[PDB]
Amino acid sequence: FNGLTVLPPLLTDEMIAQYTSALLAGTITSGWTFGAGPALQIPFPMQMAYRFNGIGVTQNVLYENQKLIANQFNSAIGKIQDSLSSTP
Amino acid sequence: FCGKGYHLMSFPQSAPHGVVFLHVTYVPAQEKNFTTAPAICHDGKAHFPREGVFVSNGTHWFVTQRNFYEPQIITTDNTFVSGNCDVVIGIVNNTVYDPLQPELD
């Protein structure tokens, strides 16, 4: 070069991925609580029932369709990677 | 947005070239372990809590609001029924008292 430079970033890629994994583990095992204070563990089906009530659908609707709901979620997550890769 | 924790209120204060917000937040503490189930099966029908969670303390089942431990007896007032008790996974068994029976008016 002729006097220019590209100083390196303080957080390396590995440390950012570590932060992201921390957030995912927190949200899967503790829901909202870890963002308001001490992380309190709650079973994942009950956490999703909480969220269903949050959008105005009674939670029994989730307990009666747990199998179907899980299948739909898995199929969507599987199609996400293919979609990102095929999109130019 | 308005501070870390469940937001209650905020008070403004002037500064020479800006504002200083004094956010008042509520933060939980001193948590405790409990065993829980998604529904109670009684008389062949499933019961769910209207608001809160079914909490067991080792030998008895109770209903309690989610954000603060305050156990109550499971009654028809704080639960609602939906269908027979074989489709939900993890259902448990227990007596669901009806306050109208003991009075027998």
Label the pairing between strands B40-42 and B92-93.
Answer: parallel
Contact residues, chain A, for B28 at CB < 8 Å: 33, 36-38
* Cα gap A85→A63, rounded to integer Å: 35
- Phi, psi for B36 (deg, rounded to 5): -135, 165
Q: How far apart are CA B9 and CA B59, in angstroms?
A: 40
Instruction: Name the minimum distance, in Å, from the CA of A54 to any CA of chain B.
Output: 12
**Resolution for this experimental structure (Å):** 3.2
Pick from B101, B83, B85: nearest CA to B93: B85
DSSP reduced 3-state for A74: helix
CA-based nearest distance B45→chain A, Å? 13
> By what technique were these coordinates determined?
cryo-EM
Handedness of CA B80, B83, B85, B90 (dihedral sign): negative
Residues in chain B: 105
**Terminal-residue alpha carbon distance, chain A:** 33
Residue pairs between chains A and B whose CB atoms are closer than 8 Å: 41
Distance of alpha carbon B9 from alpha carbon B58, whole angstroms: 38
The answer to whether residue A23 neighbours chain B at the CB level (below 8 Å) is: no
d(CA A34, CA B21): 24
Longest dimension (CA), chain A: 68
Burial of A49 (0-12, 13-18, 19+ CB in 10 A): buried
Residue listed under structure tokens 């995912």 = A24
With beta carbons under 8 A apart, name residues in chain B contacting A37. 5, 27-29
Coil, strand or helix at A43 = coil
HEC sequence for chain B: CCCCCEEEEEEEEEECCEEEEEEEEECCCCCCCCEECCCEEECCEEEEECCCEEEECCCCEEEECCCCCCCECCECCCEEEEEECCCCCCCEECCCECCHHHHCC
